[PDB]
Amino acid sequence: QSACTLQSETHPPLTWQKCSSGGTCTQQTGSVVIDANWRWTHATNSSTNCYDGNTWSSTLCPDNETCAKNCCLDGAAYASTYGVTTSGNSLSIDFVTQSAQKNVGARLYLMASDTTYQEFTLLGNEFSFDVDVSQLPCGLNGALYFVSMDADGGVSKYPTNTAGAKYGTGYCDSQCPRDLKFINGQANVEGWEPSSNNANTGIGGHGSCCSQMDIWEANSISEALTPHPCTTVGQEICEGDGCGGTYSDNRYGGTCDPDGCDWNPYRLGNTSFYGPGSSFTLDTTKKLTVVTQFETSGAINRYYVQNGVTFQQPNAELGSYSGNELNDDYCTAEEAEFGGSSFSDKGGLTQFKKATSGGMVLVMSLWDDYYANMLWLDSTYPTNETSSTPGAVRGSCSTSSGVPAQVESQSPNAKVTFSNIKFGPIGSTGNPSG
Amino acid sequence: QSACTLQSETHPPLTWQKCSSGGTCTQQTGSVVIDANWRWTHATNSSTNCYDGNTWSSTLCPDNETCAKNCCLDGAAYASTYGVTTSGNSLSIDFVTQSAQKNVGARLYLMASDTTYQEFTLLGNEFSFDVDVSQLPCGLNGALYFVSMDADGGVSKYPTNTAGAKYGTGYCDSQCPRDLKFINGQANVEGWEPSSNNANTGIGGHGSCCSQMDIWEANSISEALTPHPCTTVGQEICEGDGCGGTYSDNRYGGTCDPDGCDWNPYRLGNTSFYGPGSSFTLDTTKKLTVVTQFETSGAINRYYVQNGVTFQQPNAELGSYSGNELNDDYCTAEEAEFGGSSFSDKGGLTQFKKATSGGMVLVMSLWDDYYANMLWLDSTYPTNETSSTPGAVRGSCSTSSGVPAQVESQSPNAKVTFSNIKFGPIGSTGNPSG
Ligand SMILES: O[C@@H]1[C@@H](O)[C@H](O[C@@H]2CO[C@@H](O[C@@H]3CO[C@@H](O)[C@H](O)[C@H]3O)[C@H](O)[C@H]2O)OC[C@H]1O
Ligand SMILES: O[C@@H]1[C@@H](O)[C@H](O[C@@H]2CO[C@@H](O[C@@H]3CO[C@@H](O)[C@H](O)[C@H]3O)[C@H](O)[C@H]2O)OC[C@H]1O
Ligand SMILES: *[C@@H]1O[C@H](CO)[C@@H](O)[C@H](O)[C@H]1NC(C)=O
Ligand SMILES: *[C@@H]1O[C@H](CO)[C@@H](O)[C@H](O)[C@H]1NC(C)=O
Ligand SMILES: [Co+2]
Ligand SMILES: [Co+2]
Numbered sequence: 001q002s003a004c005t006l007q008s009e010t011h012p013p014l015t016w017q018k019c020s021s022g023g024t025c026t027q028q029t030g031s032v033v034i035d036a037n038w039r040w041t042h043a044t045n046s047s048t049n050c051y052d053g054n055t056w057s058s059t060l061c062p063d064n065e066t067c068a069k070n071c072c073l074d075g076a077a078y079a080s081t082y083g084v085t086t087s088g089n090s091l092s093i094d095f096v097t098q099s100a101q102k103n104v105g106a107r108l109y110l111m112a113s114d115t116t117y118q119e120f121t122l123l124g125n126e127f128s129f130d131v132d133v134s135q136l137p138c139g140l141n142g143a144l145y146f147v148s149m150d151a152d153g154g155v156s157k158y159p160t161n162t163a164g165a166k167y168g169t170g171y172c173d174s175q176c177p178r179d180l181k182f183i184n185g186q187a188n189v190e191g192w193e194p195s196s197n198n199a200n201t202g203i204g205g206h207g208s209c210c211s212q213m214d215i216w217e218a219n220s221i222s223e224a225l226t227p228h229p230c231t232t233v234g235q236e237i238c239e240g241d242g243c244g245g246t247y248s249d250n251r252y253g254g255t256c257d258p259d260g261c262d263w264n265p266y267r268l269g270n271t272s273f274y275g276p277g278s279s280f281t282l283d284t285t286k287k288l289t290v291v292t293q294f295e296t297s298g299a300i301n302r303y304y305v306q307n308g309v310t311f312q313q314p315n316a317e318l319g320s321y322s323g324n325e326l327n328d329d330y331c332t333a334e335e336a337e338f339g340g341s342s343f344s345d346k347g348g349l350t351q352f353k354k355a356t357s358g359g360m361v362l363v364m365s366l367w368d369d370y371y372a373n374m375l376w377l378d379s380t381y382p383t384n385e386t387s388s389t390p391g392a393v394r395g396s397c398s399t400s401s402g403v404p405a406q407v408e409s410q411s412p413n414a415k416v417t418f419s420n421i422k423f424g425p426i427g428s429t430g431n432p433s434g
Numbered sequence: 435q436s437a438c439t440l441q442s443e444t445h446p447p448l449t450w451q452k453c454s455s456g457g458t459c460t461q462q463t464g465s466v467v468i469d470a471n472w473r474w475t476h477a478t479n480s481s482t483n484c485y486d487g488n489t490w491s492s493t494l495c496p497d498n499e500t501c502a503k504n505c506c507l508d509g510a511a512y513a514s515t516y517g518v519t520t521s522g523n524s525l526s527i528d529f530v531t532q533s534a535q536k537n538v539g540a541r542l543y544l545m546a547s548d549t550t551y552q553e554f555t556l557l558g559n560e561f562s563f564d565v566d567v568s569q570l571p572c573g574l575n576g577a578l579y580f581v582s583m584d585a586d587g588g589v590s591k592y593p594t595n596t597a598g599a600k601y602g603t604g605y606c607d608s609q610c611p612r613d614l615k616f617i618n619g620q621a622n623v624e625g626w627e628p629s630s631n632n633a634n635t636g637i638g639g640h641g642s643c644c645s646q647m648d649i650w651e652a653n654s655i656s657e658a659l660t661p662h663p664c665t666t667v668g669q670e671i672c673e674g675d676g677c678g679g680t681y682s683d684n685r686y687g688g689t690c691d692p693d694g695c696d697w698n699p700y701r702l703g704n705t706s707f708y709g710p711g712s713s714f715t716l717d718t719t720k721k722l723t724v725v726t727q728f729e730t731s732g733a734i735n736r737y738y739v740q741n742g743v744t745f746q747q748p749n750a751e752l753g754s755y756s757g758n759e760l761n762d763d764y765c766t767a768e769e770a771e772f773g774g775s776s777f778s779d780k781g782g783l784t785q786f787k788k789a790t791s792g793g794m795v796l797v798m799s800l801w802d803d804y805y806a807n808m809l810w811l812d813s814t815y816p817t818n819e820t821s822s823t824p825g826a827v828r829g830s831c832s833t834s835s836g837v838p839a840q841v842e843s844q845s846p847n848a849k850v851t852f853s854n855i856k857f858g859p860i861g862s863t864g865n866p867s868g
């Protein structure tokens with residue numbers, strides 16, 4: 001796609017701290033951009049939609065190439081259309097925003113300049129942020145994560161994409177998402193099927209795959225940390241059901257691991273660690289700090305701070321594994337006890353290390369789940385299982401929770417706030433901000 | 435040996451904090467006891483010495499069993515004879531103390547009760563302490579470490595030892611030390627050879643071996659962190675040169691690894707990290723905090739705090755190893771690049787994990803080195819090597835430094851102070867003391 005300017009594009013600014021081993025931190029100035037899928041897509045020569053509801057224009061978009069030639073992405077009114085605001089080092093995303101139309105959530109990338117994404121090399125480093133999840137009920141996911149995207153959003157590889165990072169192109173993740181309207185500078189109209197339950201989305205004949213570090217997927221009830229390896233580290237197109245992932249016939253039939261080696265303290269047995277109010281170790285009615293450390297062995301370490309009190313990731317015992325570090329032994333034990341072979345099939349933490357050794361882009365989002373109602377995060381899943389099935393219970397939410405139309409109607413004012421992002425060598429981010 | 439009471443034994447009290455995963459710490463009350471080798475050893479029935487200078491009484495001690503039957507250990511005047519004082523959570527050890535006789539240094543164990551040692555299980559936990567090394571010049575070693583000693587100092591296994599932990603019996607370490615005057619409730623007079631350069635010590639026909647975690651061996655110039663595995667985890671007697679260790683003919687001819695997998699930031703190339711004054715990351719003229727974390731994989735992590743600024747162990751690159759965690763990959767790379775096979779021969783971190791999974795006793799000491807002048811810690815070693823030999827340079831001290839008689843004469847007022855000991859789950863010890 002190209003870019004149009006019927007609506008101006010002003011990326012909300014966002015600062016973050018880069019820390020060094022010598023003990024100081026210095027402020028960096030970036031901004032955030034909304035993903036292309038949230039944008040208005042129209043003809044280059046007029047205001048006629050190329051996509052509306054969950055249908056493509058059959059005249060403007062008769063095939064993937066003609067569509068990309070005819071169509072452009074336009075600018076975003078971040079606050080009034082999308083409920084996205086920033087203030088200094090803080091970012092807020094509202095759940096439902098009513099303007100001329102209803103918008104649900106957002107997916108945002110941290111930028112280095114108005115036309116390029118910021119890349120972070122996670123290996124050997126740590127990432128710290130503060131989050132307020134108090135206004136996230138069952139069925140919602142305020143997510144902070146990394147994906148192996150190109151810094152230009154794909155322009156250099158796909159010259160029919162001229163919109164680029166400035167317009168939030170080039171997304172990929174470990175679900176090999178096929179809901180993307182543009183992949184590799186083409187549209188995704190070929191093979192398009194509208195969603196049976198979502199007026200605004202569908203699934204096309206192509207998907208976009210890459211490695212994904214899910215640092216934080218959470219609401220006020222449950223939180224999870226999950227690396228997802230792919231056999232191709234960076235962004236790569238996939239074809240139809242060969243994509244695998246959530247929306248293909250076989251989620252395991254592609255190049256990425258859609259399940260991941262997940263660590264949810266509640267799922268692992270500590271049902272007192274994280275939740276709303278003073279009965280939990282971390283009180284999710286209050287802001288908390290989350291620090292994630294990527295040691296060079298490829299293992300991941302985690303600690304939290306709330307009201308000046310520090311807590312390592314809680315210990316878990318699973319099969320022959322015992323500890324609080326997300327390492328090979330944990331992931332192997334998890335597969336043995338909870339089931340599955342996707343993480344190990346895709347190369348486990350060794351393959352994942354190839355992603356964290358390279359550059360990844362920071363993503364912050366808020367979403368509800370039109371496939372599985374977020375039950376995999378915060379409820380019992382699958383819903384016919386009981387607590388006697390190892391790993392079935394992931395949180396205290398009812399198996400009836402998270403119906404998107406219901407939570408959109410009942411909780412439109414839900415929101416997530418991410419703040420005080422700090423990045424640098426392991427051990428450096430607790431030092432004073434500069 | 436038995437215990438005598440011509441001199442009373444009052445263990446200086448010492449408090450420390452036990453922290454929990456839930457974020458609080460509570461004070462514990464213990465005390466310290468001086469090792470048996472520093473004590474007066476005399477006939478049970480009189481004040482006649484069984485040992486004097488570096489010679490045993492040939493009449494009282496004609497053999498190991500008769501000696502133990504005839505002889506007892508007596509009490510210690512901690513401050514006036516040994517230069518050992520405590521105040522709350524702080525312990526100070528002076529280098530040379532002149533009373534009726536000259537005393538050099540001390541080795542002390544933390545007690546649980548007046549008759550038993552405190553045991554710590556390191557695996558899954560972390561140990562934090564503050565240290566002032568400002569008054570430790572080249573050639574000195576203020577050491578804080580753990581060894582796999584019996585809580586009773588050997589009494590249950592060796593009933594001819596009735597003095598016990600109360601009198602500092604039962605020492606062992608990864609050098610399989612043969613300088614001990616009593617091992618396994620026997621004397622060590624058989625095979626005794628006086629030291630050629632130390633008026634107060636010698637080497638006997640038996641040694642005492644066990645696993646050793648050298649958390650801290652340091653002065654104002656250099657510091658090292660070193661696990662030492664043994665093929666028998668806990669305390670075990672050894673015979674003559676079959677002991678291996680520093681003072682046997684072949685240091686590698688026994689059951690312990692006397693070299694260890696050492697991590698000295700200066701040796702590894704960072705010559706700016708630790709030293710006296712503002713030109714170093716950690717200024718050794720000032721108190722610093724040292725935290726050591728024993729993750730369940732068997733790897734060891736380390737960070738430091740000084741003036742509220744936190745520093746992970748500095749990164750090192752050695753062969754194919756890169757990082758700051760002391761793990762299998764580091765220890766293997768160290769052997770490949772610096773030389774040696776002792777650590778891996780004795781089972782490496784896997785064997786070492788058996789020690790940290792069990793109980794170990796806390797040791798604090800101050801010593802000078804009558805074998806190698808502490809050059810292995812703070813100078814170039816061996817002394818004919820140059821900086822072009824990988825790992826030869828371990829600190830900035832002259833290869834002429836550390837002659838015991840010289841440093842004892844020039845620096846008698848040297849001292850080390852250890853304080854604010856805190857122990858608990860990984861991530862817990864930075865929380866407020868209780
Ligand atoms: O025509 C434009 C609309 O299409 C646009 O609607 C937004 C489309 O994206 C929606 O978010 C989806 C949520 O799930 C992700 O997986 C999808 O990729 C996203 O597309 C968003 O809720 C809609 O508001 O709004 C502007 C119109 O001009
Ligand atoms: O007779 C008693 C003396 O023997 C005693 O002297 C102390 C003996 O221990 C000395 O410390 C040695 C240092 O190196 C360690 O490896 C040794 O095991 C220790 O023995 C200490 O410096 C001497 O003061 O003092 C009291 C006398 O009654
Ligand atoms: C030494 O370590 C400190 C602390 O990590 C680091 O900031 C510095 O760059 C290192 N210097 C060298 C020469 O390795
Ligand atoms: C949950 O984790 C916290 C923090 O480590 C710990 O203090 C608590 O004992 C754990 N509870 C359970 C049930 O595992
Ligand atoms: Co195709
Ligand atoms: Co013997």
Ligand SMILES: [Co+2]
Nearest residue numbers: 295299729733
């Ligand atoms: Co580790």
